[PDB]
A paper describes a structure:
14-3-3 proteins recognize protein partners phosphorylated at serine or threonine in certain sequence motifs in all eukaryotic organisms. 14-3-3 proteins have a highly conserved dimeric all-helical structure. Each monomer can bind one phosphopeptide via its amphipathic groove. Here we study the structural basis and druggability of 14-3-3 binding to E6 oncoproteins of four tumorigenic HPV types by a combination of crystallography, binding assays, and mutagenesis.
Nevertheless, the effect of FSC on interaction of longer motif III phosphopeptides with 14-3-3 is less characterized. We performed FP experiments to measure equilibrium binding affinity constants of complexes between the four HPV E6 phosphopeptides and 14-3-3 isoforms ζ and γ, in the presence of FSC. The addition of FSC consistently decreased by 1.5- to 2-fold the affinities of all eight interactions (ΔΔGav = –1.3 ± 0.5 and –1.8 ± 0.4 kJ/mol for ζ and γ, respectively) without altering the apparent preferences of the different peptides. Next, we used a soaking approach to crystallize the ternary 14-3-3ζ/[name] PBM/FSC complex and solved its structure at 1.85 Å resolution. Also, FSC binding reoriented the C-terminal carboxyl group and caused local destabilization of the very C-terminal residues of the phosphopeptide, increasing their temperature factors and dispersing the local electron density. As a result of FSC binding, the water network around the phospho-PBM C-terminus significantly changed. Nevertheless, the simultaneous binding of FSC and E6 PBM in the amphipathic groove of 14-3-3 indicates that such ternary complex can be used as a starting point to design both stabilizers and inhibitors of 14-3-3/E6 interactions. We also showed that the FSC molecule, a well-known modulator of 14-3-3 interactions, moderately destabilizes E6 binding to 14-3-3. This indicated that the hrm-HPV E6/14-3-3 complexes are in principle druggable.
Numbering used by the authors:
A (entry chain B): -1 to 240
B (entry chain A): 1 to 240
The structure:
Amino acid sequence: PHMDKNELVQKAKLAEQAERYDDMAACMKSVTEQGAELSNEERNLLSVAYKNVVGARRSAWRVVSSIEQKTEGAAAAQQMAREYREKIETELRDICNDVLSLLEKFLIPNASQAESKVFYLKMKGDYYRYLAEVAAGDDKKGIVDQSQQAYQEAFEISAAAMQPTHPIRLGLALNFSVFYYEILNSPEKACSLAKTAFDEAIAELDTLSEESYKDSTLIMQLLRDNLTLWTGGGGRRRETQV
Amino acid sequence: MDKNELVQKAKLAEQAERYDDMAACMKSVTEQGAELSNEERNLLSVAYKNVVGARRSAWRVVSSIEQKTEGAAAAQQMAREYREKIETELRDICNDVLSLLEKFLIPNASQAESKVFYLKMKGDYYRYLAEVAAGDDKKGIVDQSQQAYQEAFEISAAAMQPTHPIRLGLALNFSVFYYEILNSPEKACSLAKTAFDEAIAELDTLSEESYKDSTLIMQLLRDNLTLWTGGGGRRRETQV
Ligand SMILES: C=CC(C)(C)OC[C@H]1O[C@H](O[C@@H]2C3=C([C@H](C)COC(C)=O)C[C@H](O)[C@]3(C)/C=C3/[C@@H](COC)CC[C@H]3[C@@H](C)[C@H]2O)[C@H](O)[C@@H](OC(C)=O)[C@@H]1O
Ligand SMILES: C=CC(C)(C)OC[C@H]1O[C@H](O[C@@H]2C3=C([C@H](C)COC(C)=O)C[C@H](O)[C@]3(C)/C=C3/[C@@H](COC)CC[C@H]3[C@@H](C)[C@H]2O)[C@H](O)[C@@H](OC(C)=O)[C@@H]1O
């Protein structure tokens, strides 16, 4: 029925504890469709739910894609893997389009604060990036442009209105960096973006609050994990403190 | 879709951890009516193990939340109704498996090892029904599980080696059935200890490269024995 948003959130937390993320996503989708601005808690429940729904397809897509490449010497096995991948892609695009619709219809146009604006624009960039991961041929370029345009708009807002220690500004830099490295095949810009975001958070560490401490320090390590991974083939100088 | 294509897509779904797809593929193979190979048999069981295991895990999480929700009638009802929703999915899965066992797998089982596999499976999925049963229907569900386990137990005791992973796995689950469903811990321990002792008497067989599965089940059997027997004056163990 048309239930209260607190009732739906309660059901979403029940589904989250049971690791039933379809249910959790359906509850938070209904919360979004009521048209009221999401609280930080509801926003995070929505994001986590669809993170898990789409992630199951992305991990399965990579497994099947790898098998398709490993079986390229046999036509029957390769075609079976290809057709299974195409089924998974259809599920993947339907999920991404579902999230992208909720962003366009409810979340982005109703975002009244820069923090939430950046959150939803980063989400838009992420789910277009997930579409880019499985886009083939000539239709990839348009999807990549959509991802970049949302990331860059979120980056402009974030650079002007958010501290470098804010988890959303850090998470934006992390994923935008991955976009440059893996979608645009631009490792220099990807490393520059990751290194700058980390360094700026370190430089202004005194702006980090307790409520953002665990999230921000986690994402700062994710930034360094990627930099260390990418600045391989020589380099990755160890760090001291004197 | 031909038989061999279905099995190949089932293996594909297994690697992708898409167990609903895997179960659907092996159910279609089963419904073709021919006897399953040992590989196809294992694919079918692993598929439905994961499909039903997700509901059982979620059932226990939601049941616990529901039981801990005192003085919040609305929240407790919401938790119960969500558990009941999970229960319905769980029953449909078990009924699906039990129907496949009764219509195809058990009647077509040509040799003892297969008969024991499928009869153990029938005992297992009736046991899963018993875990969420109550009222009047539980007694009948429990009897169905015990009768399937018992026949598998008599066939395996007759025609299978004590080191066979199917016979060991039967002893593991039948003993748990006794401990947990029938509240017969001494029967449960004796069943588990006899199977463990009879297999450890052929320890050289268990060390062979082909007996990794029996080796795993032997760890579980002894784990339950340690859990159920002793555990009072035990001191922690080290190894220099
Ligand atoms: C019940 C609510 C749940 C679903 C658990 O919230 C998830 C998490 O929600 C918050 O954390 C957010 C957040 C995450 C944190 C980095 C988790 O950090 C930990 C474990 O310490 C991961 C999540 O996916 C989430 C919600 C998302 C993002 C992501 C948003 O892009 C659009 C990039 C930034 C990051 C932000 C929003 C984090 O603030 C919280 O601050 C976290 O609490 C902790 C651990 O401090 C909580 O684990
Ligand atoms: C990887 C998965 C696939 C390919 C589907 O096979 C699952 C597994 O299938 C076989 O193992 C069976 C088997 C299991 C073994 C205990 C797994 O052992 C190891 C070392 O991983 C667990 C499975 O669920 C399965 C198929 C089921 C049963 C169970 C059936 O009850 C009705 C009773 C005991 C056990 C038997 C049938 C085992 O022989 C094999 O012997 C295993 O191979 C090894 C190396 O142990 C393989 O991992």
